[PDB]
Amino acid sequence: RLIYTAGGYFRQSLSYLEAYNPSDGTWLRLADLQVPRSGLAGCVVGGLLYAVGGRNNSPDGNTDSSALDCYNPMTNQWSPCAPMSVPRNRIGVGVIDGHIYAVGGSHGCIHHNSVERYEPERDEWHLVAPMLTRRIGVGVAVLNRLLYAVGGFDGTNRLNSAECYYPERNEWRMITAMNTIRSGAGVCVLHNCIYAAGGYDGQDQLNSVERYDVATATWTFVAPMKHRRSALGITVHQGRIYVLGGYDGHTFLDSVECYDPDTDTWSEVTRMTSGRSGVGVAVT
């Protein structure tokens, strides 16, 4: 399977889309986004890539995006899908049972607690029960058919909270907080363990990575990345974690690091074409 990157920001939101294969280590340029947008998330359902939320390039008035769009790698064609109820810049996303869950994100000065679910069958959104916190820069990631809305910023406090959602009950549960504060962290599940790689805390942009096992309900640290970064893209391919892009305060990273859980070691496997922050990453 190929890993992708959609959108991104480099002094300007980027309309790019690219693809990568770990078996040969090569980059493949693909059909550019119809509207450029950073601060967005991406995912795949039914072998079609999706590019949820973000922020338009403009640059005029106010343009946070409530925009859902779908890509077909076989035909290489972008379609426009039903737009979310509210704009969501700095958004996370997760998928349960073939539905797409938009969680949080900013719209102007408003930092959303609201959440909405997308059915591809029908092509429409349904506003679900909101989170207990407000969260922009929020890492979403799914563990055994439950949605963990990790970290974020609420409008005044950068947070270490990492509440969880129960689709069967339709309610949110405030579980155990992270050791390190993380706004703009990247989160993706692997082997019954949620991971929180990098982000921004206050002074420092972080390189530290920590891992959440459910029962014990504790955040055990893991080997940190080489480069410190928030706003990174993140995903999993073949029992390893791949961390694309970043914003280290002073530069936009073109690095791509790979975490091997089998050894607890980070290793760079390549470099992107042009370094950017705020991509939407997925795998098919």
Ligand X SMILES: NC(=O)[C@H]1CC[C@H]1C(=O)N1CCc2c(OCCO)cccc2[C@H]1CN1C(=O)c2ccccc2C1=O
Q: In 10 A of CB 269, how many CB atoms?
A: 13
Q: Which is nearer to ligand X, 41 or 81 (CB)?
A: 41
For residue 274, give both structure tokens: 């042009």
Taking alpha carbons only, the member of 283, 279, 200 closest to residue 245 is 279
First to last CA, the chain: 5
Q: Residue 150 interacts with ligand X (CB under 6 A)?
A: no
**104 close to 138: Cβ distance less than 8 angstroms:** yes
**Rounded to an integer, what distance in angstroms lies between the CA atom of residue 95 and that of residue 181?**
25
Token code pair at residue 267: 């290793």
If the CB atoms of residues 87 and 184 are measured against ligand X, the closer one turns out to be 184
Regarding 228 and contact with ligand X (CB under 6 A), the answer is no
* From 89-97, 121-129, 143-151, 256-264, span contacting ligand X (CB under 6 A): 89-97
Count the residues of the shown chain that bind ligand X, applying the rule CB under 6 A: 16
- Residues 40 and 27: their CA atoms lie apart, in Å, by 21
- Cα 205 to Cα 181: distance, rounded to the nearest angstrom: 10
Mapping DSSP to helix (H, G, I), strand (E, B) and coil, where does residue 148 land? strand
Interface with ligand X, residue 196, by CB under 6 A = no
- Would you count residue 41 as binding ligand X (CB under 6 A)? yes
Min separation Cβ 247 and ligand X, Å: 4
Interface with ligand X, residue 17, by CB under 6 A: no
55 contributes a contact to ligand X by CB under 6 A: yes
The H or E element containing residue 107 is strand 106-107
Q: State which residue has the least CB distance to ligand X.
A: 39
Cβ 115 vs Cβ 132: under 8 Å = no
Of residues 58 and 267, the one with the C-beta less far from ligand X: 58
CB of 71 to ligand X, least distance (A): 16
**178: which 2 tokens?**
């992270």
4 contributes a contact to ligand X by CB under 6 A: no
Pick the binder of ligand X from 6, 20, 39, 115 (CB under 6 A): 39
Nearer to ligand X, 11 or 122 (CB): 11
Stretch that binds ligand X, among 39-47, 77-85, 141-149, 203-211 (CB under 6 A): 39-47
Applying CB under 6 A, does 278 fall inside the site for ligand X?
Answer: yes
Q: CB under 6 A: which stretch of 18-26, 88-96, 156-164, 261-269 binds ligand X?
A: 88-96
What is d(CA 101, CA 96) in angstroms, rounded to the nearest whole number? Answer: 8
Does 188 engage in binding with ligand X (CB under 6 A)? no
Least Å distance between CB 201 and ligand X? 13
- Given 142, 277, 282, 283, the residue binding ligand X (CB under 6 A): 277
Interface residue with ligand X, options 40, 187, 197, 234 (CB under 6 A): 40
Minimum distance, C-beta of residue 281 to ligand X, in the bound complex (Å): 9
Q: 220 - beta bridge partners?
A: 211
- Which two tokens mark 215? 């029962």
Instruction: For residue 101, give Cα distances in angstroms to 10, 93, 118, 129, 223.
Output: 27, 6, 6, 12, 30
Q: In what order do the strands lie in the sheet with 218-222?
A: 186-187, 194-200, 205-213, 218-222
List contacts with ligand X (CB under 6 A).
9, 38-41, 55, 89-91, 137, 184, 230-231, 247, 277-278
